[PDB]
Ligand binder design. Structure first.
Ligand code: HEC
Ligand code: HEC
Ligand code: HEC
Ligand code: HEC
Ligand SMILES: [Zn+2]
Ligand SMILES: [Zn+2]
Ligand SMILES: [Zn+2]
Ligand SMILES: [Zn+2]
Lengths: 106, 106, 106, 106
């Protein structure tokens, strides 16, 4: 349930994808990431603890997760259809979403 | 967190939108729908009760939720912006995603 | 390349998908709909001839086309994977984007 | 019309968004990038002239453009709402799509 725990689960499963052998491994990891992302959006990060839940900073923080869930969905199509290289390449593009949110609120 | 309960909160909040006057009411209903959707995809429907979580059928079952969440995300842009009518029209288009899943797994 | 011709293209190719025998016929028809959608969005519909290109109605008019292109994209995943029936059902959900615009602007 | 011209349009307008002062400049530049993306996806790049138009590389080539159009769509929400800064940040998240495609196919 914890924001820090959700970030650890996102971190571990991202590496899993990068170095996966089969599609079953990639799909398992992406589904775990989707769970963590769904649980993370409702949390308030330390940096934004003083700002209202309707601030333009709390929008955007939530928005980051909608984008990530969209990317996971897209990777899932590729993994399920046995394109393991394409799935791994797509997963590499998640980092961009990771980095942009971290550069503002981490 | 029950599948039936999450469906109720989805069904209720969609009617709230239809009858809303201001944008703040729309934002509040869409956030609740997003939480329910994020909570419902992990559950197993009575029609697939004998199927494994990593089975092919469970994969397409979760697919409808990925599409739903992206439509809530899109509607949220309009509601946060203050475009009440357009947000209501966006919310209406959800009904098709609701319908398609129900045809297959209900 | 005018609005009416592009609407004929979308209409015809949607029938092609519904009556398709194979995935290759589905791929071909989705490609043609993507080209039609890409060519249609810059046009001005007769009912908004009095409005500026930069106006809330014209932003909304073009929006319907980003949604359609996104749905075509999703359906192409399914047809490239060889999932013909799933791709035919996904193409059916396009109809709601068709009707949403038509109710406002046709 | 040809792929090189399309790529210059994308490049020029991306710089314009970075250096933009008003929402009107961002709107116009994002719209021009949407048209360029739409005219680019049907071409065949030099490095894939020897491959089949139904090959996984050609599928992946076209796919990069659907992702870009979705990101331009996303940024236009922010720009049409007058929100210049976050429309500009959204526009930066788009380089990751530019780079993934050049890293494999340019
Ligand atoms: C890709 C999807 C992501 C990976 C991999 C990681 N994140 Fe994040 N993240 C975000 C915040 C606000 C924090 C700080 C939370 C706090 O300080 O309490 C983090 C933190 C991490 C961490 C460090 C965890 C630790 O205790 O050391 C890791 C390893 C991590 N994140 C990996 C915010 C966001 C965010 C905003 C919307 C996104 C999209 C991501 N994080 C994505 C990723
Ligand atoms: C699959 C991807 C689904 C999507 C998307 C939506 N729903 Fe659903 N819903 C789904 C199932 C499998 C069921 C049946 C579960 C059961 O055993 O009863 C339902 C059920 C409902 C119900 C009936 C609830 C009840 O207790 O009888 C309603 C009112 C309902 N769903 C509404 C609904 C709405 C409004 C949605 C979109 C906004 C929607 N659902 C999406 C599966 C899926
Ligand atoms: C707005 C975003 C639209 C979307 C999405 C779709 N259509 Fe459309 N269509 C639209 C307009 C404004 C019009 C009127 C054009 C005019 O100059 O009068 C239309 C018209 C049609 C027609 C009739 C064309 C004619 O014979 O005059 C058809 C058959 C049609 N549209 C089909 C169609 C389909 C199948 C779509 C979904 C894939 C669709 N349209 C989307 C605006 C919009
Ligand atoms: C693949 C799906 C691509 C995406 C997404 C983007 N680009 Fe691209 N670009 C791509 C190819 C295959 C090529 C080479 C074409 C050739 O004839 O060699 C390019 C090339 C460019 C160039 C070079 C222009 C020139 O004179 O040769 C530029 C400046 C360029 N691309 C910019 C660019 C930008 C800014 C993008 C993101 C918005 C982008 N490209 C995406 C393939 C793909
Ligand atoms: Zn995709
Ligand atoms: Zn939108
Ligand atoms: Zn999908
Ligand atoms: Zn968005």
């Amino acid at each position: 349930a914890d924001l820090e725990d959700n970030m650890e689960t996102l971190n571990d499963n991202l590496k899993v994808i990068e170095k996966a052998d089969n599609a079953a491994q990639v799909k398992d990891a992406l589904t775990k990431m989707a769970a963590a992302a769904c649980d993370a959006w409702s949390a308030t990060p330390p940096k934004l603890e003083d700002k209202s839940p309707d601030s333009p900073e709390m929008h955007d923080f939530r928005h980051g997760f909608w984008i990530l869930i969209g990317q996971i969905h897209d990777a899932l199509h590729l993994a399920n259809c046995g394109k393991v290289k394409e799935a791994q390449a797509a997963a590499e593009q998640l980092k961009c979403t990771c980095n942009a949110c971290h550069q503002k609120y981490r």
